[PDB]
Every structure is written in structure tokens, then in C-alpha cells.
Amino acid sequence: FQSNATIELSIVIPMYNEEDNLEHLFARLLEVLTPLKITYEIICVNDGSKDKTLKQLIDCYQSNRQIKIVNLSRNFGKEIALSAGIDYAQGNAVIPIDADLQDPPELIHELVDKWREGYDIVYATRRTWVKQFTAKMFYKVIGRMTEIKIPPNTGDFRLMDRKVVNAIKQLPERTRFMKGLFAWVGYRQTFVLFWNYWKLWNFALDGIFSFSLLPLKVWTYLGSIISLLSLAYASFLILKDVPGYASLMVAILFLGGVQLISLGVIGEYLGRVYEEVKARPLYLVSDLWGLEYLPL
Amino acid sequence: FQSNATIELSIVIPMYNEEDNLEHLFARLLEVLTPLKITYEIICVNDGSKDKTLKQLIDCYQSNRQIKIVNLSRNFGKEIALSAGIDYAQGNAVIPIDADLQDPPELIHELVDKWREGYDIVYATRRSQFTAKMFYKVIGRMTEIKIPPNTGDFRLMDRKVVNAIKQLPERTRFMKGLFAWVGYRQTFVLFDRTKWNYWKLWNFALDGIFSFSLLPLKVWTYLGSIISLLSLAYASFLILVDVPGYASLMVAILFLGGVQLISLGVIGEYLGRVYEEVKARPLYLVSDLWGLEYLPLEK
Amino acid sequence: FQSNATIELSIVIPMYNEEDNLEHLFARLLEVLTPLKITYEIICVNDGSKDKTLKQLIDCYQSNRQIKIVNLSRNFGKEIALSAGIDYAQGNAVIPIDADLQDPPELIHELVDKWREGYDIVYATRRSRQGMTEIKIPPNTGDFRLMDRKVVNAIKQLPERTRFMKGLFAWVGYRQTFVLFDRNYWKLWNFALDGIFSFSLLPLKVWTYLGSIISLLSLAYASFLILKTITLGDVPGYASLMVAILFLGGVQLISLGVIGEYLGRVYEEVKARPLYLVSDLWGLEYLP
Amino acid sequence: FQSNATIELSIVIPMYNEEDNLEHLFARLLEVLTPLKITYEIICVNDGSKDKTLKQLIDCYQSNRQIKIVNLSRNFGKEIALSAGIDYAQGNAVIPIDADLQDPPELIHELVDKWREGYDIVYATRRSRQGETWVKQFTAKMFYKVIGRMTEIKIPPNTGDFRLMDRKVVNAIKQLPERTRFMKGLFAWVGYRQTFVLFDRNYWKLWNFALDGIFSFSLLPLKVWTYLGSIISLLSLAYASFLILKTITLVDVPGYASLMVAILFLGGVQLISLGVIGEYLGRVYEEVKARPLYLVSDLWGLEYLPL
Ligand SMILES: O=c1ccn([C@@H]2O[C@H](COP(=O)(O)OP(=O)(O)O)[C@@H](O)[C@H]2O)c(=O)[nH]1
Ligand SMILES: O=c1ccn([C@@H]2O[C@H](COP(=O)(O)OP(=O)(O)O)[C@@H](O)[C@H]2O)c(=O)[nH]1
Ligand SMILES: O=c1ccn([C@@H]2O[C@H](COP(=O)(O)OP(=O)(O)O)[C@@H](O)[C@H]2O)c(=O)[nH]1
Ligand SMILES: O=c1ccn([C@@H]2O[C@H](COP(=O)(O)OP(=O)(O)O)[C@@H](O)[C@H]2O)c(=O)[nH]1
Ligand SMILES: [Mg+2]
Ligand SMILES: [Mg+2]
Ligand SMILES: [Mg+2]
Ligand SMILES: [Mg+2]
């Protein structure tokens, strides 16, 4: 009869219009977390639902000490409402879970076991020439574990140690932790076994611009050397071949073309500077049930 | 009788050259606030008045425990002088009121009524075509707050809303779009008795798409880049089809020279917004305070 | 008889190679501050002097309780060394003066009298001759002024406190007055242009609208006014090509000038390096 | 004997795949620090090593109270792993040393001697008299005008990575992201009391850092080009307004000789304006980014920051 006051595991569940599944969600999770003999909590983030999902949450909160509600002021999205629950999650390990149980909750028993071996981040991965080209370009930077990338694998069902949650707590990229932040932070990582390449390589471009200044730096010197090769081609060649229209239009279309993507890479990084300096917060909490406001 | 050390309501009245209306304003407010039987405070923000308005404020301060003065260092904006009073206003609900008193102060009896029901932001809009059908689907579900014949400047905000926007520079222009972003429980009450111009309302729709979004900068970067690869590839292909001479040489140099100027506009616009976000300069400066304490110098 | 804990007045002196003036500066200052019957402190900021200025300062520090030394790591300039002196200066009023006494210390008695009346900022501007406030063109108000504690705290975190006379004095407001005493026009509007960029943003928005509307008058003229009149099969080509490339190619450079001007100000606001570095302190405490 | 609570010296060593050198490193260092009779600590930064370097550090940690370990989450640069150790190093003086022992550790006796004399920064530049040429005299004269008499700590065949720093200096640059490249210009900007100690035991990267210095510690590359770019804009604007106001004629002057050059000159100066603007924009992103400089996975013999 020892009353333990420390929380070991946190289950963060972003929910938007999940009124029917609330009965099957909390019940199936209970038969998985009970045999673990580990103190836990369930953080339920209300993402501005209309179908009275909040009223049904307060009923589960009223008869379950492990149910805690984070009511958002409006609909902010899955990635943002999930970050809201992790901020209010004060456990040693954090496991985000979808409400429709697309992944089996029994994998929590497999996530916590590999977590107690020393690994700080534990993933859960399911199982033409584009499949051989994409898988080869990424192993040169991602590292040992790239199976979380190849479709239809998404690392949205994972376990993270408290050290990883606090590290990326102040980073605006914590909303899209799978967009590349997982590979930058490193730590001890592993996974357990159990699409659309147009959007897969859209993250490849979004990752090069976010974690690197190469697109801006490379085109700065590339756009500078062709400016020196420019001004020199009319410096010594003005004291006096002249194809006329065969190069008056070409130079107008070339020198004017290289500037448009120079303004493109500048406007891209400028928009990223605004996102980093803006004072507008990521989300707003309307009400809280079973939790305290932040900062504590 | 017992005492109470918690303020429940805070009204904020920015004042510039309001030497005349002080006697009628406080008398009118007292006959409205006293029947509520609720603890309140009155924040009067002297915004660099020149007609001895402050000298009359201090006299009202001396004889009324509810009067609290925030004297600014110089004359700032009416929106700025309003944010100063909200920063120094304690209490669970904040409602700013004007000094000319175009809207009846008795309307606060119903802003507080909808606030007790659970609504966090309660507007007071006056009663009186394609644009209204536009904003109802993209901007806000309650377009009646920012209608031409009435602006939502007479409103009541809960403490949770005041604290959430305390650090945002957009709190100066809360009606310029920030109200549609914060969410929360919103509702309005309807009443009857420059602005109101349609060019000034779409200026609010233009100032909003740039403040709360990156689309004007993102859609133009991708657009200016795809026309750039068309410009450099068609130039290489033209340097090895039809060569219309002046019918293309004048058009091309004048098209690229014009698309770069608008590209420089969206960059210079967002650069000015990045600048205003990183300034260490505050919105206002407080010269003197009556019945209040200074804010922590951390800021 | 009895002790006093709070300091009322603070005199801040930036010092660079002032080994000689120290005997005459402290003696003449004591002759003016003593009849005031007001507790005071003297903050001396050593701005990397090459001579024996610091050694003579510590000697005056040993035999005078009102002398306090702020030793900067290297030379940072008169403006930065003066901002450092005010940062370490406690006291309801702050009066900065120079070591070479072009500013007569006897004006301190007149600046403190205007401050007693309620003025928050009292300037000491030299008389002009030659051929409110706004004395910023002939000799003009220098760094000789009085500022209440409320003013120095308001602009403490502001980087513009270094150049307080370049425009920040007109932005802060407060109760201001000046005092006249005796004994280039290019720098006039160089500082007037330095102010219209820091406290306005209008030079950026005015050229954004002007640069965009002439981009509308531009694009529309050749997109389908030239395309609609030449689709049938024109203005003097060379006369129209030269006037187009040099009007459009040049207005972009002014757009690049204002954008590059405001980009540098963003870099100065967000840079993490400090304005100065203190090497040693005498009779003071470190910040924060 | 009695106990002392203040640490006088802090030795920081970044370590990446130094499994073999750990035995000789701690042994040779202990024979240099023991005669000093001052309290010291050794901060070891595990910069994501791949072999068993961390396993051997913990054993040395288990039998030496001066050994302290900072295990980074992954492999960063040498400049980053060294800044991580300085953050966790507590002591009146800080001396960074390499693990492969490229410079003799007996110079610590000379660095501490110059530190107690009042110098806040004490360098240890190698004494090399070879390579004296006209290019070595031009760079020396150009760098002496901004760095000072101390500028001798950066000859081509040596740097200033072996140095002593007082606590006042490591605190002054603690929050500065330029602390990693401290020997890229930041040393000349702080301007504390500096000196060096001599011992005997490329020009591409020298002027590449001199170009990286005028952009980092100045705005001249941006301010000079905006003024130079605006004055040649007035020259192109007025000269064009007069060429179009010259109505005393009507097919071409210098036709393709000047018009092809005009689009060329005005099109090249903009690319240089875009270069300096994009360069400083990337610097603004590096200053405002919330992403940290490193991440600590585990600590041995230390506490997490802030204290
Ligand atoms: O706007 C949204 C949409 C998603 N969700 C939650 O995020 C999870 C995503 O599940 P869904 O099946 O709707 O998306 P998908 O499975 O395709 O990723 C669900 O538990 C939702 O409750 C949310 O909180 N806000
Ligand atoms: O510089 C100013 C201008 C206005 N006001 C206050 O804001 C209100 C503006 O009233 P006005 O009739 O001019 O604006 P409107 O009634 O149309 O909102 C007045 O009550 C003033 O007290 C102010 O504090 N400072
Ligand atoms: O690099 C400098 C130059 C100026 N000063 C101080 O600033 C004051 C102004 O002196 P200066 O004659 O050079 O300026 P001016 O008289 O021309 O205004 C003097 O007391 C100096 O001690 C300084 O601290 N560091
Ligand atoms: O990626 C790296 C490379 C360097 N080092 C450390 O930094 C020092 C540099 O050693 P190296 O000989 O490789 O560099 P150099 O001697 O040429 O300066 C070594 O002690 C390493 O332990 C590190 O921690 N991470
Ligand atoms: Mg699902
Ligand atoms: Mg009015
Ligand atoms: Mg002088
Ligand atoms: Mg080595």
C-alpha cells in the first residue's frame, strides 16, 4: 500500500471528433497498461471538437484518476495538439497514440522493454527503382535505422525518454519531429517490427532548408561568380563577337532568371526567420482537467 | 461588513484631452457598476493630454478608491494607450470603454451576463454583401463583429484571453484579425443608438493575410522560381524558334524586371515584420502611476 | 553623525588617456558637489587608456569614497563607455560629463534645480549664435544632460541608449527642458536620416508601395499593351529598351538598398554579443 | 589535512575515438598537474565515439575524483564538443588540450605563471622562424593593424588552440554562438589582457577567415555596397531620364555595344547585392534559431545546466 507519487509513463492521445471510439479506446489501453505494473497517465488533448467529445471526456475524467484533459481553444491540428499534450506530460517516457488504434496498443509492452535496455528513442515500424533510389540516398546521413522512412512506415508511434522531450521542448520543429529532427538529435535509437514519394521527397527539400544553409550559401557564391563572369564580360569587351538578338535576349533571360531563384531562396529563409522570431504561440489552452497550467 | 482583496472587473478608459467629460463619465459609470454589487476597478490612461485632464483625474483619484491613473510619458496611440491600461489592469474580466461614450455604459450589464455563462470573449456589436459571404468561410464564423457599421472595440475579455495575448504585438490591433486566431468561446450582443469604409476593411483583410500566414511569401517564391526555370531554359533553347525581335525583347526584359519588383515587395514586407518582432523598444513608456504598482522590469 | 544608504546623484565620466586632468577634474567636481549637500557618486569608466590613467584612478579611489572605477576590457569608444557607466550607476539622477571640462561642472547645480521642479530630462545645450527643445543643428545638445531614474531604466535594454541624441530623446517623451551656456551641416541630416529609419519604417513601406505600383504600370505596359499592338505586326526600340532596363534595373537597387538597410538593423537587434565587456570593477558590484 | 571547495584549474579535452591514448593521457597529465599544488578537474567530452572510448573513461572516472565525463548525444564538431566542456567546467582558469597530445602539456606551468601575473588570456604559440617571405610580411602588416602586438599567435604553421582563459572571459562569451570559432576573430574583439608563450616542438583558410571576419564583426560589406549600389543607381537613373528626354533625334546610338553592356552591368551589381543580403540573412537565422548547439546524453561527476 505504498502511494507512489512519480509518473513513469505518459500516453498522449490527440483527439478530434472521436466520440464513438472513446469507449473502445480507454478500455483496450487498460488491459495493456495494467500488466506492466507501472504508474502511468493518459493525456487527452481536445482539438476543438464539435460532436460533444469533450463532455464524454469529462465523464471518463470523473471516474478515472489517470485521465487528464487538455482543452484547446480551437482546432489547431494533429501535430500541434500532440505537442500540447507532451508539454503537459510529466512522465519518464512518452508514447503518442492515435485514437482510431491504427497501431496495436500491445506494442507498448514492446516499447517499454526496449526502453529499459538503455535506448532513449524506440520506434515501431510496420512491414520500381524509386524504392531502391530513395532508400540509398538517405542511408548516407540518417544512420543505422532508416526502416522508419521507407513507406508505409511512419514513426508517429514511438517512445521517447524524458531527456529527448526536454531537448526539443523549445524547438518549433518538435511538431514535425519525423520531418528530420529525429536524425539531428541522435541519442540511442532503435525500433521494433510488427506512401506517395511526391510527399516523401517534399520532406527531403524541407529538411535541407531547415537543418542546413547550403541552398542559400551555394546559390550565393554560384550567383556571385556568374556576376563576376558577367561584369568582366562587358568590362574588357567595352573598350571596343556581337550576335545581337541571339544574346541580348539570352542575357536578359539568364541574368534575370538567376535572380528570381536568388530571391526565392532568400524569401524562403526570410519566412523561416519570421517563424523563429514571431511572438505568436503554437497553441492556446482553453481549459484543463486534472492538470496544472504552464509554467508550473 | 467584510472586505475582499480580489478585483472581478476592470474597465479601461484611454483619455486624450478629455477635460470636459470626466464628471459625466464617472457619474454615468457609477450608476451602472454599483447595481452589479461586484468588485471593480477603473483604469484611466492619460495619453499625453494637454488640457489639464490629468489634474482633474488626480482629483477624482483622491475621492474614489476605484480610480487608478496610468500617466504615459508622451502621447502614444489610442490603441497603444489602451494596451497600457490592460497591462496594469487586474481582475478576471477586462472591458475597455471610450471617453466620448458613443456606446451606452449600461451595456456592460449584459457583456458580464454572457461572460458568466462561460463565454471568454463577449463582443458588443451595433446593429444595422459578397464580402460577408467571403469572411464567413475563411476568416471568422461571426462576421457580424467586424461589419462596416460597427467595429468590435466594445468587448469583454476573460483573464485567460488577456494573458494569452500579453506578449503578442498584435494585441494593439486585436480587431485586425487576432480575435479570429485566439479562438476560445466567443459571442456578441446586439445594440443600437470614421472607419466604416470598405477600403479600410479590406486593408484589414490584407494586413491579416500577411501577419497570420506565409502564403503571400511562399506562393510567390514557387511562382517566381518556376518562371525562372522557364526563363533560363527557354533562353538556352533560344540560343541553341520564332524570334519576334522587339515583340519579345521588350516584353521579356520588362516582364522579368516587373516580377522582381513585386518579389522585392513581399520580401521587404516580411522583413519589416521580422524587424518589429525583434525590437527591444517597448510599445509605451509610463511616466507616473496613481493607485497602482510598476510592472516587473524583466519584460 | 548618521549614515545614509541611498545615493541621490551619479556623475559618470568616460575616460581615455586622462592622466593629467584627474587632479583638476576631481577637485573642481568636489567644489561644486559639496555645496549641494546631496549624497553622490562618481563613476569613472576606463576605456582602455594607454597611459597611467587607471593607476591614477585607483589612487583617487583609495582616498575618496565617492570614486568608483569601471575598467573596460578594451577601448569601446566614448558612447559605449558612457552607456557602461550609466548601467553601473545607481542614483535618482544621472549626469554624464567629460574629463576635459568643456562642460562646466557648475552647471550641475542648475541641472539639479530644474530636476527638483519635476522635469525628468534636463539638457545642457550650448548657445548657438551663428547664421520644444529641438536644439540639434548649431552646436546642439551634447551628452551633458540630467536624466531621472525612470528614464535610464526605460531605455536600459534599448540599444539606442548609446546614441540617445540621434533620435531616442524625442521618442521617449517625459518632462523635458534645457539650459543654455557659453564657453557641420552635413552631420545635421546624416543624423536626421539615421532617425527616420530607426523609429519609423516608413522609408520601407513608402518605397514598397511606390515600387509595386510602378511595377503595375510597368508590367501592364508590355504584358498585353505591347503584345496587343504588335500581335498585328512600336516605340523607338533602342530609346524604349534603354529607358526600360535603366529605370527598372535601377529602382530595384533602391529596393535592395532599403531592404539591405533594414536587414542590417535586424542583425544588430538579434546579435548575441554584448555592447561592451568589463575587465575590472572598483567599489561596485557586477551585473546582473 | 583539510578540504578545499574551490577548483582552481579546469582541463577540458574533447574525445573522439581515443581508446588507446586514454592511458598515457591521464598518466602524463597527472605528472604535470601534481607539482602545481592547486585544485584541478578534467572535463572529458565524449563526442559520440564509435569504439570503446566511453567504456574506458568510466573506469578512469571510477578511480579518479578529478575525472568528469560529458557524453554528447552524437558526434558534433571539435569546436562544439570543446564548447560543451567549457560550459560544464567550473574553475578560475580553463585550458583546452587535445587528446592525441600534439603539444607538450608542460606548458601549463608557463600558462598558469602568466595567468597569476594578471593576464586574463595566455596563448601558447609555436616558435617557427621558417617560411619568412613577402606574403608572410604582408599578412602580418595587415593583421597587426587590427589585432595588435599579440597578433604573433597566428602564424601560418600555428594557431591559438592551446590557451588559458580566466573565468571572466569564459563567462563573457558563454551565451555567444561565436564561442566555437573563438580563434576566428572573437579573441581580438574581447580585448582582455592577453599574452603568449613560445615553444619549439594554409594561407587559403587565413584570408577565408579574414573574409568571414569582416562579415561577422562588421556590417561594412553590406553598408558599403548599398551606398555604392545606390550612387550607381542615381547615375543610371538620371542618365536614362536624359536619354529619353533628348527629343532632338529619333534609331540607335551605340546599339548592341552599350545596350548589351547596360543589361549586363545593372544585372551584375544586383547579384552582388543579393549575395551580401543573402549572406547576412543566413547569419540572422543562425542567431535567432531555437535549435541548440549540442545535446548531452549522460553525465558522470557533474550536474546538468542550469545549476
Ligand atoms: O485536426 C485533427 C486531426 C487529427 N487529430 C487526431 O490525430 C489522430 C490522427 O488520426 P486520423 O486517422 O484522423 O489521421 P491519420 O490516421 O490518417 O493519420 C486522430 O487520433 C485524431 O483524433 C486531431 O487531434 N486533430
Ligand atoms: O491620441 C489619442 C486619441 C484617442 N484617445 C482615446 O480614444 C478615444 C478615441 O475617440 P474617437 O471618437 O476619436 O474615436 P472613435 O470614437 O471613432 O472610436 C477617446 O476616448 C480618447 O480618450 C487617446 O487616448 N489618445
Ligand atoms: O575613445 C575614447 C574617446 C573618448 N573618450 C572620452 O570621451 C570624452 C570626450 O572627449 P573628446 O574630446 O574626445 O570628445 P569631444 O570633446 O570631441 O566631444 C573624454 O572625456 C574621453 O575621456 C573615451 O572614453 N574613449
Ligand atoms: O569530430 C571530432 C574530431 C575531433 N575531436 C577531438 O578533437 C581533437 C582533435 O584531434 P585531431 O588530431 O583529429 O585534430 P588536429 O590534431 O588535427 O587538430 C581530438 O582530441 C579529438 O578527440 C572530436 O571530439 N570530434
Ligand atoms: Mg487513424
Ligand atoms: Mg469617440
Ligand atoms: Mg572632450
Ligand atoms: Mg591532434
Residue numbers in the entry:
A (entry chain D): -3 to 123, 129 to 195, 207 to 252, 259 to 314
B (entry chain B): -3 to 124, 133 to 197, 205 to 251, 258 to 316
C (entry chain A): -3 to 127, 146 to 197, 208 to 257, 259 to 313
D (entry chain C): -3 to 197, 208 to 256, 258 to 314
What does the paper say about this structure?
GtrB is a bona fide PI-GT as it carries out the first step in the glucosylation process, generating UndP-glucose on the cytoplasmic face of the inner membrane, which is later utilized as a glucose donor during glucosylation of the O-antigen.
GtrBSyn, the PI-GT from Synechocystis sp. F215A, which resides in a functionally relevant region of the protein, has compromised catalytic activity, but the structures are essentially identical, and unless indicated otherwise, we show here the better F215A model. The UDP-glucose donor substrate binds in a shallow cleft on the surface of the cytosolic GT domain, in a similar position to that determined in other structures of GT-A fold GTs19. A divalent cation mediates the interaction between the diphosphate of the UDP and a signature DXD motif20 (94Dx96D in GtrBSyn).
